[PDB]
Design an enzyme around this catalytic site. Structure first.
Site, short mmCIF file in Angstrom:
data_model
loop_
_atom_site.label_atom_id
_atom_site.label_comp_id
_atom_site.label_asym_id
_atom_site.label_seq_id
_atom_site.Cartn_x
_atom_site.Cartn_y
_atom_site.Cartn_z
N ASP A 1 34.86 32.61 50.29
CA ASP A 1 35.94 32.92 49.34
C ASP A 1 36.55 31.60 48.85
OD1 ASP A 1 37.60 34.16 47.58
OD2 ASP A 1 38.65 35.35 49.10
N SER B 1 46.98 34.27 46.35
CA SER B 1 45.53 34.01 46.49
C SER B 1 45.19 32.60 46.05
CB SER B 1 44.72 34.97 45.60
OG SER B 1 44.50 36.12 46.42
N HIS C 1 37.51 34.83 44.85
CA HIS C 1 37.84 36.09 44.18
C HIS C 1 38.65 35.89 42.90
CE1 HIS C 1 41.31 36.14 46.83
NE2 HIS C 1 41.94 36.64 45.81
N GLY D 1 49.45 37.23 44.31
CA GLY D 1 49.77 36.03 43.52
C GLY D 1 49.51 34.79 44.33
#
Lengths: 185, 51
Positions: free
Chosen positions: A63, A141, A33, A139
């Site tokens: 992901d 991720s 993402h 943040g």
């Protein structure tokens, strides 16, 4: 720059998951993402230090994404913060894990479930996720989930927060390593 | 910023901040919108970026 550090794209900030390589080519893994629609990556908010460019992105469904390093001098540590990482492994229920991310730093917990489906909305559904009781915030991720010196996963998303407790889902790192033909070092 | 499709059980964790009417910086749209719901529609958007 190592696992857990901030990375900036033209849109926002994520966390570097793991530094990996293939032959003599260096890359880093982060969340898909985060790589979706990003081209260039920098090491600071001012965008003055270039890291590299997106080479692959898989989101939704999975992901994970990878970025190829174009910066020739920045140190590319095979660690997470100071923590050395020597191999990748599969998550298991009851496993003690630790996450590091650019907003909240280091937090620990354990794997509570495997192969979970997370529906982020509007058709963004991810499958095969590792669930845990580790918190995470915006943040964070793409930062690493590890156990000791073993790489386990990449932060994807979740609920709650570090103050009150939460649930975080991670993409298994093994799947990304295999997809790109890269390995941790 | 439309929070009609909220709430959502989980949010991705990228950072692209919004400034709430409670003077709190929300780390992303997903976080912001779930707060709106949680507040039963009283929280609004002040401006984009950090507060």
């Amino acid at each position: 720059i190592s696992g857990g550090d901030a990375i900036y794209s033209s849109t926002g900030r994520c966390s570097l998951g793991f530094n990996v390589r293939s032959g003599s080519t260096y890359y880093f893994l982060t969340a898909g993402h985060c790589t979706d629609g990003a081209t260039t990556w920098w090491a600071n908010s001012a965008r003055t230090t270039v890291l590299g460019t997106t080479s692959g992105s898989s989101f939704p469904n999975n992901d994970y994404g990878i970025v190829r390093y174009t910066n020739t001098t920045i140190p590319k540590d095979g660690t997470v913060g100071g923590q050395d990482i020597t191999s990748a492994a599969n998550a298991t229920v009851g496993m003690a894990v630790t996450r590091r991310g650019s907003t909240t730093g280091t937090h620990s917990g354990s794997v509570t479930a495997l192969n979970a489906t997370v529906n982020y909305g509007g058709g963004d559904v991810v499958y095969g996720m590792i669930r845990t009781n580790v918190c995470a915030e915006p943040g964070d991720s793409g930062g690493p989930l590890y156990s000791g010196t073993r790489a386990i996963g990449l932060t994807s998303g979740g609920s709650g927060n570090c103050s009150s407790g939460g649930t975080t889902f991670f993409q298994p790192v093994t799947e990304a390593l295999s997809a790109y033909g890269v390995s941790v070092y | 910023v439309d929070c009609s499709e909220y709430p959502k059980p989980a949010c991705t964790e990228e950072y692209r901040p919004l400034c709430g009417s409670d003077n709190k910086t929300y780390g992303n749209k997903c976080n912001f919108c779930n707060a709106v719901v949680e507040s039963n529609g009283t929280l609004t958007l002040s401006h984009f970026g950090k507060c």
